[PDB]
Structure 1
Amino acid sequence: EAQVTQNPRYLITVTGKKLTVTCSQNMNHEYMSWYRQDPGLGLRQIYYSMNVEVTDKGDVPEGYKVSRKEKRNFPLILESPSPNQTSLYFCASSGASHEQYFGPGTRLTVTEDLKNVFPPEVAVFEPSEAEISHTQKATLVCLATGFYPDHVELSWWVNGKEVHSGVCTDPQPLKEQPALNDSRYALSSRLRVSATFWQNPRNHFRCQVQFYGLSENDEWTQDRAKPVTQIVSAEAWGRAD
């Protein structure tokens, strides 16, 4: 433990709506900073503060502001969030060793419209008979599709509990529409058991996907259900056959 606290953990907002991400730390560190991280571009410093009321820009300051009125706090302020500020943000602090310890991360998506937000749809695909006959193994595939933003956590549950053996999930979501601007996303994961285990109709498999979407405070007046933070799942039973 003994780390920084970033608030919130996930956030969707429309272009232009002022927002601020908090960073606090009860370790009495003089040095605090904010970083973003982007595919291809590395981890870059936005703003940093070497002490109370001392404040300097990093390599990517534009569109951001900070303040340091007290030691414990370093807020990141976006006056007019722009689509290019869609990113993964980390806060960090350091004391006398000058080693910076990093917060857990804030995933921020800046969208042209909240109407672009969708929960994932989820499907489990049953092991192939061909495979069981060929390898005496059986792999389930989960597919989560149509989700925006890519703010998801996938997990596999067997017989009521989460499993980890035989699992692997894509590091990164795919864009369903590499053309479109706020393209929806898809994610895949596989769970592999023995043939015998899969062939047991007592075994129950669920693929679970936590999605982080619109909070209670967001205005929604549309036919479809409010794309709030929620869980969507898909299940399969073992089959003798």
Structure 2
Amino acid sequence: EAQVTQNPRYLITVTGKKLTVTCSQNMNHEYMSWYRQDPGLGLRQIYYSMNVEVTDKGDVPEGYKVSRKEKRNFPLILESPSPNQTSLYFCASSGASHEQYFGPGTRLTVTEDLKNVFPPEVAVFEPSEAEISHTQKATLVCLATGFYPDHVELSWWVNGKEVHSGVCTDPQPLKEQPALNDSRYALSSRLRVSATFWQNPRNHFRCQVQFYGLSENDEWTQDRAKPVTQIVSAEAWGRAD
């Protein structure tokens, strides 16, 4: 399980405030590079290091800076962050042969104002009586809406234990307002179980949505609750026929 380590994993910032995403690798690889990934553009190299104190700018380097004082680390510095630096960043290491080891990725969002950050609202919709008589299977639908940025993790928990069998979550969030640059997002997931399971009133279905928002450090002058990193849930209990 050794791998490339990226810290932080998620981050929201105001245009201007400088930031640095570090990247560690304990495999003694001399090669390290940063990549950004955007929809429709794929993976684009930013900078790359062939060895200690060796640095060369990749395809899209404007706005970024790196340093390679140590073999283990290859940080990425953005002096004056901008809205277009909003992206999914990856750090990679290469050693034996020339095989790439990618970090888990960093999701960075540079927003004009922190007043745009909203946590999700989660709701669970119970199985249709129609679907049960016609199919003998019950489908619950979890809806996570109005969150920004698009940084969420959703998961189902039945009777206190996580579930995988019978769930389908959208691969990526939906932009509620495609035409807006600061639009909020939605995500849905499905949990289908036999009609028998659903009819037991002792069964407990809970939808869990982890939001990555502000840190407890960020200032906040608005009235509504500070949109901090947090977990929001929603449940339903089995209903007898």
Q: 2:188 — aligned with what?
A: 188
- CA deviation string 1:153-183 (max 9, x = no partner): 0000111111110100000100111122210
Map of 1:52 onto structure 2: 52
- 1:96: Cα distance to partner? 3.6
Question: In structure 2, how many angstroms separate the alpha carbons of the residues matched to 1:163 and 1:215?
Answer: 29
SS at match of 1:133: helix
Report the alpha carbon displacement of residue 225 of structure 1 after superposing the two structures with TM: 0.9
CA distance in 2, matches of 1:30, 1:49: 8
TM-score by length of 1: 0.98
Give a deviation string over 1:131-168, Cα, whole Å, max 9, x none: 00100011000000000001100000111111110100
Task: Give the Cα–Cα distance (whole angstroms) in 2 for the partners of residues 40 and 10 of structure 1.
Answer: 21
Aligned residues: CA RMSD = 0.9
1:27-66 Cα offsets, whole Å, 9 max, x none, are 2211110001111111111100001111111111111111
Deviation at 1:4, TM superposition (A): 1.2
Q: Comparing 51-60 with 140-149, which one deviates more in the overlay?
A: 51-60
Shift of 1:25: 1.4
Matches within 5 A, 1:147-186: 147-186=147-186
Aligned pair count reads 241
- The whole-number CA distance in structure 1 between the counterparts of 2:206 and 2:238 is 11
CA distance in 2, matches of 1:157, 1:98: 41
Measure the CA separation in 2 of the matches of 1:100 and 1:172. Answer: 25
Q: Structure 1: how far apart are the matches of 2:3 and 2:226?
A: 34
Query: What SS is found at the alignment partner of 1:196?
Result: helix
Shift >3 Å, 4+ stretches: none
Q: Is 1:128 matched with 2:128?
A: yes
Q: CA deviation at 1:193?
A: 0.5
CA distance in 2, matches of 1:25, 1:163: 32
Deviation at 1:229, TM superposition (A): 0.6
CA separation of 1:194/1:96 partners in 2, compared to 1, >3 Å: closer, same or farther? closer
TM-score normalised per structure 2: 0.98
C-alpha distance in structure 1 between counterparts of 2:99 and 2:56, whole Å: 18
Once residues 61 and 156 of structure 1 are traced to their aligned partners in structure 2, the CA distance between those partners, rounded to angstroms, is 40
